[PDB]
Design a protein around this ligand. Structure first.
Ligand SMILES: CC(=O)N[C@@H]1[C@@H](O)[C@H](O)[C@@H](CO)O[C@@H]1O
Ligand SMILES: *[C@@H]1O[C@H](CO)[C@@H](O)[C@H](O)[C@H]1NC(C)=O
Ligand SMILES: *[C@@H]1O[C@H](CO)[C@@H](O)[C@H](O)[C@H]1NC(C)=O
Ligand SMILES: *[C@@H]1O[C@H](CO)[C@@H](O)[C@H](O)[C@H]1NC(C)=O
Ligand SMILES: *[C@@H]1O[C@H](CO)[C@@H](O)[C@H](O)[C@H]1NC(C)=O
Ligand SMILES: *[C@@H]1O[C@H](CO)[C@@H](O)[C@H](O)[C@H]1NC(C)=O
Ligand SMILES: *[C@@H]1O[C@H](CO)[C@@H](O)[C@H](O)[C@H]1NC(C)=O
Ligand SMILES: *[C@@H]1O[C@H](CO)[C@@H](O)[C@H](O)[C@H]1NC(C)=O
Ligand SMILES: *[C@@H]1O[C@H](CO)[C@@H](O)[C@H](O)[C@H]1NC(C)=O
Ligand SMILES: *[C@H]1O[C@H](CO)[C@@H](O)[C@H](O)[C@H]1NC(C)=O
Ligand SMILES: *[C@H]1O[C@H](CO)[C@@H](O)[C@H](O)[C@H]1NC(C)=O
Ligand SMILES: *[C@H]1O[C@H](CO)[C@@H](O)[C@H](O)[C@H]1NC(C)=O
Ligand SMILES: *[C@H]1O[C@H](CO)[C@@H](O)[C@H](O)[C@H]1NC(C)=O
Ligand SMILES: *[C@H]1O[C@H](CO)[C@@H](O)[C@H](O)[C@H]1NC(C)=O
Lengths: 97, 273, 101, 274
């Protein structure tokens, strides 16, 4: 093994994990579950030269996806459909901030 | 009640077949909870019968066929229509998720059309086959961990993988409520924040009973999860601009519908001028 | 514009490795002073992520690799850079699996 | 007084040979890349001095500045272009790749090629649109930029060629004014001692701690931290556990930033008791 030169992680979109919390489905009670518990999303990441610049999305897209709200009732559960808004980044740039 | 002949039938593709079923009282068949094209007929000797012709046999037909007693005791037949253009009998998405209230035997309902097919059970991303017994009529039955599984078979000469199933065992236990408040004595026009915390159950119901409830705009509680392994679910009740009368009994009644364990803790909060 | 709605069922993020970003801080390279810059500021590291279908099941690395890479301590003198080398080892995950807990 | 036969910008064919001449009333020399190359110096009976360098087997890398100066700020510069397909952008030192600035000004991305007829464009490292920046085949692109990385592009032969990436970086700079304190000015034997030095405004600074336990006696390594990254807030903490005596005395934090050499210091007295 040779220690290669480190390469900067460029400012660009990369796949991350987004948690579909119950909070975003119903913040009033806790009598349910949501499935799946997490999904993938594209998000700007990487770094810039300085702190006077920041890696920020140049274009974002909000899209609806269907999740399952699972309420239980006597050993049998109640399945229900629910839509959650996912945000993806399509492109980025180091933005002077 | 009787049928010709029973109990398990293996039919050829696109071929034809007739199933009969008679009993002293009226009779009817039902495939998938809904009765298909039948032909009921009453015998002069006080005998009712029912027949249903299965034309153009296709794998998708493979399944349970019953014979009841209408316009808990019946006779079920299982029919296999070996169709090489059909891998695993497609099934509902509600079937793909297996939620459980306790530790018990489980069945992964992945079924084939040909009784002579070798079906193996695997973890979604796993190659080795699992030592679980298979019943071509019901699938794999055994004990599992909360993971995802798929079945595999060799139709023709190509390996086929059914959908993925997900085991999920709910988190249940005894219920104990722990109520508190930022301060049981608040001044007029200030904030009334109470926090009802319960740990052990995943899905619990929260019900707040208080003074400013009946005949008056109620409050919306806000739940939150502390930890996720040993479920620490917290429900807080916040009342900004504390008017009077708010002084009184604030009780948080927590119940889990999985079973039905209940519990309730109350505190008294006074408001001073 | 618009189109006929096609429901999109959410798909679970599988426990597997994805590329994450590690910030290489000055404190990391040398916490005894603050007269240098670090280059590059960040690097890509493979890491395990995603959820297991359940809270008492965790996604965890099964193969870990310590990979060293060389960065630079850049001192600035009268606005002229002096380049010194440093080595930082990255903790890559090459594989994962859901593990009951 | 200095003259070169002939000057000023040359474009020479690869592998050829060229002779440049420089003369003046006092000694004279040719310098390429900061170091005077193989010359043949001489003097004239009329009191004239001269130097002639023989460029042999010209290659693209011979592209660049060549100066004639007076030694054993007034000089004569010649720019020589040696078009050479085997060469893309002229290679430059890691120091030229980082462009550190202390104020807002014009900037030059020094990406240069060997052929003056080559087309060259400026791009944000990852970016396809050519930036509208004037170019000078001798020097590179000059304009105003933000703190990003840039590459230059050119087509040599038929292939697109990319330069190394250049990084524009404006350091955060300002006056220095130290602020020091201690967890407690009066400590007891066997206990910990800890002081803090915080300076704000500069991204890079040198912290210097002078204290009792220093001369003749293992010194203490401070630990630096960054509180706030926008206006740079840097903190240095000197920690001395198991405080022995003698530790009592003056403790100082001298702070200097090397970009503009500003300095500042604050002293505080700590006394240890038994
Ligand atoms: C002065 C000199 O050496 N020129 C050479 C010669 O081959 C020609 O004049 C040119 C192109 O025509 O290429 C070069
Ligand atoms: C044959 O199978 C097709 C496909 O299900 C069906 O539509 C048709 O009714 C069947 N009977 C025939 C032979 O037409
Ligand atoms: C009709 O079907 C129901 C289904 O449970 C059964 O209980 C009932 O006995 C049937 N009617 C007759 C023939 O009694
Ligand atoms: C809940 O736990 C408390 C102790 O913290 C106990 O006193 C109470 O009886 C429990 N609730 C019930 C009745 O299950
Ligand atoms: C709280 O005080 C009220 C008086 O307004 C009383 O009715 C109630 O019983 C108290 N809460 C309980 C049940 O402990
Ligand atoms: C809990 O909330 C109130 C408290 O009396 C009541 O209306 C409700 O039925 C209780 N839940 C149960 C049945 O455990
Ligand atoms: C020109 O000089 C270079 C470098 O010494 C050499 O590689 C090349 O062979 C020379 N040209 C000739 C005459 O072959
Ligand atoms: C540092 O801050 C102090 C005021 O708190 C003052 O000396 C000056 O404004 C700053 N820099 C200096 C030493 O001029
Ligand atoms: C810091 O230390 C002392 C304190 O003034 C003095 O030598 C000078 O100001 C600084 N030393 C250096 C290396 O600049
Ligand atoms: C199975 O029986 C059918 C008669 O219904 C006929 O096509 C043939 O004998 C067999 N078909 C196969 C599987 O070759
Ligand atoms: C009540 O709590 C404090 C009171 O100072 C403050 O957060 C706000 O006034 C109220 N809560 C909120 C943020 O609504
Ligand atoms: C040679 O250059 C240096 C300055 O760089 C200085 O000695 C003087 O300018 C020149 N010497 C002569 C011959 O005047
Ligand atoms: C420093 O001394 C030791 C460890 O260095 C320990 O007591 C603590 O971390 C510090 N002293 C205290 C208690 O402030
Ligand atoms: C530290 O404080 C003492 C007073 O106890 C003073 O004499 C000394 O000059 C101070 N340190 C310095 C050198 O500023």
């Amino acid at each position: 093994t040779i220690a290669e030169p480190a390469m900067i992680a460029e400012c660009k979109t990369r796949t991350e994990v987004f948690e579909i919390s119950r909070r975003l489905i119903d913040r009033t009670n806790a009598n349910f579950l949501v499935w799946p518990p997490c999904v993938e999303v594209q998000r700007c990441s990487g770094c810039c030269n300085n702190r006077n610049v920041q890696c920020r999305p140049t274009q974002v897209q909000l899209r609806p996806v269907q999740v399952r709200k699972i309420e239980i009732v006597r050993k049998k559960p109640i399945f229900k459909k629910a839509t959650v808004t996912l945000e993806d980044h399509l492109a980025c740039k180091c933005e002077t901030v | 009640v009787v049928t010709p002949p029973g109990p398990e039938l293996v039919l050829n593709v696109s071929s034809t077949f007739v199933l009969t079923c008679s009993g002293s009282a009226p009779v009817v068949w039902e495939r998938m909870s809904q009765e298909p094209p039948q032909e009921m007929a009453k015998a002069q000797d006080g005998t009712f019968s029912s027949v249903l012709t299965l034309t153009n046999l296709t794998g998708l037909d493979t399944g349970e066929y019953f014979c009841t007693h209408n316009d808990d005791e019946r006779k079920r037949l299982y029919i296999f229509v070996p169709d090489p253009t059909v891998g695993f009998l497609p099934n509902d998405a509600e079937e793909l998720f297996i939620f459980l209230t306790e530790i018990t035997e489980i069945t992964i309902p992945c079924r084939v059309t040909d009784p002579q097919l070798v079906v193996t059970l695997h973890e979604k991303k796993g190659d080795v086959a699992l030592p679980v017994p298979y019943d071509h009529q019901r699938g794999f039955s055994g004990i599992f961990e909360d993971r995802s599984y798929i079945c595999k078979t060799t139709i023709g000469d190509r390996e086929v993988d059914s959908d993925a199933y997900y085991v999920y065992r709910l988190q249940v236990s005894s219920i104990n409520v722990s109520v508190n408040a930022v301060q049981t004595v608040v001044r007029q026009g200030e904030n009334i924040t109470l926090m009802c915390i319960v740990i052990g159950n995943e899905v619990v119901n929260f019900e707040w009973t208080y003074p400013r409830k009946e005949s008056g705009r109620l409050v919306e509680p806000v739940t939150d999860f502390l930890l996720d392994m040993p479920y620490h679910i917290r429900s807080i009740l916040h009342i900004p601009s504390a008017e009077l009368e708010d002084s009184g009994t604030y009780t948080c009644n927590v119940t889990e519908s999985v079973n039905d364990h209940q519990d309730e803790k109350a505190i008294n909060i006074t408001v001073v001028e």
